[PDB]
Structure 1
Amino acid sequence: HWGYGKHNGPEHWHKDFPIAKGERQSPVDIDTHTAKYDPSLKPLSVSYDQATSLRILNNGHSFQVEFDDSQDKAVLKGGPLDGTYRLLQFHFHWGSLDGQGSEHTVDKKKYAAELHLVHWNTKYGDVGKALQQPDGLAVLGIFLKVGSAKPGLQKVVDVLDSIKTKGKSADFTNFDPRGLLPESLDYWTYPGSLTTPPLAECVTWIVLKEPISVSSEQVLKFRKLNFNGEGEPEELMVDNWRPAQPLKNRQIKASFK
């Protein structure tokens, strides 16, 4: 029943998911002058050479590109993490207007969109068990600004008309997620939560400082998606972002000075 409307959006979620008002909720504003450089943080090891994408799905909240996570094939290691995190899926959050759409903000700046690569800690064996642990998931977050097209995004944008409505999926094999990364892996990190219900507090957030540029045509195709299912009234899938939450007793650390 949750969503992003006036009636069912972020200010309502706490009634079904009381952790919404918890101590380590996401997203947050990243105050760049308060984040402390941590010389002990390691470079982020993104190993996506063996990634096996399988499918793309309109889940009614976002669209997601899913991967085979039954073996280490696409993994995130290093940075603030202990151990090995397998890539499950990526999805986006976007706005109705280019001045909004990201969940994390940087000195209160909103980006047009935000990409989340969702990974789970292999020690916990499966993602449902990982959801129950404070170090269960790691999300690599990447900001999108509107300018030049991102060539590595076009295969995704070109299949969206086939998954226009909630519950539609399409085979999506041989997609390389390396094409969605910026040149620099400099990042901020903090302990947080899912930004969508159940808002579980199990995520180590790794947010890249460098945003990727996507064209206005690419983000317009995201805005043609629908939150509704086939044969129901049309509600464009836009503004599917949760606003920044209180930082509370948390420190954001920077990998770079």
Structure 2
Amino acid sequence: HWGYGKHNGPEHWHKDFPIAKGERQSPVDIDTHTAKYDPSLKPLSVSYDQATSLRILNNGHAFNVEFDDSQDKAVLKGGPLDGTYRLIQFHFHWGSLDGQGSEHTVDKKKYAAELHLVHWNTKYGDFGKAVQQPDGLAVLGIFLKVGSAKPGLQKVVDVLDSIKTKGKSADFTNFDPRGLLPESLDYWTYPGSLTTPPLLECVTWIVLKEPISVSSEQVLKFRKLNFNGEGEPEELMVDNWRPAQPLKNRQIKASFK
């Protein structure tokens, strides 16, 4: 009823999810010149040392690498955040070509892909309760550009053959998400939403300024995935990104000058 095709893509989602035309939708274009430095922001605290990855799942729109979120094992704190946010899963959005794929844009520039590390606020007890709150989630977004390989991505790329089609999953233990981060934690932040239906306005977005580099071969493997289930007509899982939405009454803040 929703996807990324011609007939069910972003431009249609409002029919079933009227919040698509809401006041704090994501992604947005990040106008670097109009973002303002906020000296009172903190440094981000990314605490992933005890992360417990469990599984990787092709859900028909992306693949999610899922984590044990039943304890404070892999948490995000600081920055604009009040309290502790637990990592539940990460996934990517990517293009059919290297010139598109990201959801956020930077001065209208599209990156080849975007990584979303999804975290929920522990004050709300579980993910499903957190998405109903204005400060329920914190998503760390990281741009991908094509160049050198990202070594810490390779273990993800190499399991993708085992989850080609919608509904397939595979064990994915002992994966360290720290290997997906860039050097700098400088960031922009703003209040927004989930970027897939149900498009709930529950996200504090934290978008890193510094992209990571991945190789051609790595992104090419993303593009071999399928939106369809096994035994259905093959449709490559590409261009699974929502375009930039109106900023409306929001200001994007920068952690850096």
| TM-score band w.r.t. shorter chain | over 0.9
1:124-165: CA deviation from partner (whole Å, max 9, x where unpaired): 000000000000000000000000000000000000000000
Q: Which runs of 5+ in 1 are unaligned?
A: none
Shift of 1:17: 0.2
RMSD: 0.2
Summarize deviations over 1:10-68 as a string: whole Å, max 9, x none.
00000000000000000000000000000000000000000000000000000010000
The 2-side partners of 1:238 and 1:133 are apart by 31
The 2-side partners of 1:253 and 1:174 are apart by: 35
- Report matched runs for 1:97-246 at 5 Å: 97-246=97-246
Matched residue SS, 2:114: strand
Percent identity, aligned pairs only?
Answer: 98
SS at 2:149's partner residue?
Answer: coil
Secondary structure of 2:11 counterpart: coil
Q: Distance in 2 between matches of 1:35 and 1:211?
A: 18
Distance across 2 between alignment mates of 1:16 and 1:66: 27
1:84 CA drift (Å):
0.1
Structure 2 portions without partners, runs of 5+: none
Give the Å deviation of 1:240: 0.2
Write the distance in 1 (CA, Å) between the matches of 2:237 and 2:220: 11
For residue 10 of structure 2, give the secondary structure of its aligned residue in structure 1: coil
Runs of 4+ in 1 over 4 A off after TM superposition: none
Question: TM-score of the superposition, structure 1-length normalised?
Answer: 1.00
Residue 83 of structure 1 deviates from its aligned partner by 0.0
| CA distance in 2 between partners of 1:46 and 1:16 (Å) | 35
* Rounded Cα–Cα distance in structure 1 between residues aligned with 2:216 and 2:49: 29
Alignment TM-score, normalising by the size of structure 2: 1.00
Which whole-Å CA distance do the structure 1 matches of 2:180 and 2:36 have between them?
Answer: 27
Aligned equivalents of 2:157 and 2:60: distance in 1? Answer: 17
Aligned-pair distance for 1:79?
0.2
1:162-199 residue CA offsets vs partner (Å, 9 max, x unmatched): 00000000000000000000000000000000000000
Deviation at 1:252, TM superposition (A): 0.1
Whole-Å separation in 1 of the counterparts to 2:100 and 2:234:
22
Provide the C-alpha distance between the structure 2 equivalents of 1:5 and 1:80, rounded to a whole number of angstroms: 35
Q: 2 CA distance for matches of 1:138 and 1:7? A: 31
Q: Is 1:40–2:40 an aligned residue pair?
A: yes
How many residue pairs match? The answer is 257
CA–CA distance in structure 2, aligned partners of residues 188 and 157 of structure 1: 28
